[PDB]
Every structure is written in C-alpha cells, then in structure tokens.
Amino acid sequence: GKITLYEDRGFQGRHYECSSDHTNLQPYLSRCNSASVDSGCWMLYEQPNYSGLQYFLRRGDYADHQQWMGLSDSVRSCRLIPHSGSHRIRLYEREDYRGQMIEFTEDCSCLQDRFRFNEIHSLNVLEGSWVLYELSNYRGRQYLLMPGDYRRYQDWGATNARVGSLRRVIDFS
Numbered sequence: 001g002k003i004t005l006y007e008d009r010g011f012q013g014r015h016y017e018c019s020s021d022h023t024n025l026q027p028y029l030s031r032c033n034s035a036s037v038d039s040g041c042w043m044l045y046e047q048p049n050y051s052g053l054q055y056f057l058r059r060g061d062y063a064d065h066q067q068w069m070g071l072s073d074s075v076r077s078c079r080l081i082p083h084s085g086s087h088r089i090r091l092y093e094r095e096d097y098r099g100q101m102i103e104f105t106e107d108c109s110c111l112q113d114r115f116r117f118n119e120i121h122s123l124n125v126l127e128g129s130w131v132l133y134e135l136s137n138y139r140g141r142q143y144l145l146m147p148g149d150y151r152r153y154q155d156w157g158a159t160n161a162r163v164g165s166l167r168r169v170i171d172f173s
Contacts, residue, residue, distance in 0.1 A: 001040020084128030
C-alpha cells in the first residue's frame with residue numbers, strides 16, 4: 001500500500017509517503033489537510049499510537065480532511081489494513097460473547113433493520129477486516145475491526161457500544 005499525506009489543502013505543502021503502519025506521524029507531517037491514496041486501505045487516527053478518532057480511506061485524492069469525514073487536520077498515526085476477499089463478523093448483544101448474536105459476511109447499511117439491539121457489547125472478527133460505524137449509512141464515529149476477539153466495546157476503541165452499520169475492508173479487486 002501507498003498513501004501520500006499533505007500538510008495543506010489541495011495537495012499542497014509538505015508531504016509524507018507511508019507504506020506501513022506509523023505510530024507517530026508528527027515528526028514527518030505537522031498536520032494533514034489532504035491525502036492521495038495510491039493503493040491499499042488505510043485508517044487514519046487523530047492521536048499517535050492509533051488512538052482517538054479514526055477515519056477510513058480508500059484509493060483516491062482527498063483534497064480536504066472533511067472528504068474523509070475528518071473534522072480537523074490532526075492525523076498523527078495510521079494503519080495499512082490488509083485486503084481480504086472473504087469477510088465474516090459475529091456481533092453480540094452482551095459482553096463476553098453472550099446474548100443474542102448476528103453474523104455478517106457482507107456489508108450492512110442499517111444494523112437495526114437486522115438486529116434488535118442498537119448496542120453491540122462484544123464481537124468476533126472471524127475473517128477479513130471491517131469498519132464499524134456508530135450510525136446507519138456509514139456515518140458517525142468509525143472503528144477499525146481486524147481479526148480477533150473483542151469482549152467489550154472498549155476493545156475496539158469506542159466510548160459507547162452503538163453500532164449502526166458495518167463495511168468490509170476491500171481494496172480494488
């Protein structure tokens with residue numbers, strides 16, 4: 001994967017190219033107001049060490065941070081999300097894999113049309129990577145979900161358990 005991050009809007013100013021996860025972009029990039037994603041799928045984080053608000057980016061030329069839903073020019077760490085052709089995720093009503101469960105192998109734009117609970121309190125990412133969204137139609141806060149087991153919503157970096165939609169992470173293929 002390859003992403004070029006720019007300090008100023010419209011692909012202007014100083015820039016930095018990433019091909020792997022970076023824990024702290026600030027020494028290499030003082031602020032981020034535009035980005036060109038040449039390949040791969042990327043998660044941008046507002047703070048270093050993959051903390052704070054998250055934003056998912058795919059190939060394309062984002063002329064302003066608002067175009068990736070970012071509300072500021074603070075982009076201080078980033079992850080390259082490995083592509084998968086197959087995806088599977090299991091969502092649970094309660095913590096520790098308890099209560100009612102629903103499984104997805106495809107995107108879902110409105111979880112509440114499919115599942116009774118607005119809150120998801122644990123989940124298993126069985127295959128591929130996903131982005132979960134706080135609101136329906138891929139809106140609200142975003143959380144990157146890579147393969148693994150998550151016993152509590154805080155395990156995916158959220159401050160509440162609300163999930164309204166979810167998307168498979170796929171590069172061009």
